[PDB]
């Protein structure tokens, strides 16, 4: 946003144009898969999930 605040022209831009959500959604998808703390639920008896 701070980059394209300057390169864009004024009196034409909007928050729909300024905002790129793809690094945020890539950070979420890169956390939930392929991290240490996000593991498969160990279920072979209900004590193990707990």
């Amino acid at each position: 946003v701070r980059e394209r605040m300057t390169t864009q022209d004024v009196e034409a831009i909007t928050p729909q144009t300024l905002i790129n959500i793809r690094p945020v959604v890539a950070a979420i998808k890169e956390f939930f898969g392929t991290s240490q703390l996000s593991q498969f639920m160990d279920q072979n008896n209900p004590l193990s999930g707990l």
């Binding site: 909007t14 928050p15 729909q16 300024l18 905002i19 959500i21």
Partner: protein
């Protein structure tokens, strides 16, 4: 600016997601706001996050 996050319903229930291998997600919605200092504006949308 950035303000007021609000959620929708989940797009698909639990068993259907576990069946069709979709994740159990819900959309974000955030009211962004752009203010021009020189001439005076706000630009308020509902940005899908």
């Amino acid at each position: 600016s950035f303000s007021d996050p609000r959620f929708d319903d989940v797009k698909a229930p639990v068993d259907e997601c576990k069946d069709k291998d979709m994740t159990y997600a819900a959309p974000l919605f955030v009211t962004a706001e752009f203010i021009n200092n020189n001439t005076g504006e706000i630009k308020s949308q509902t940005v899908f996050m």
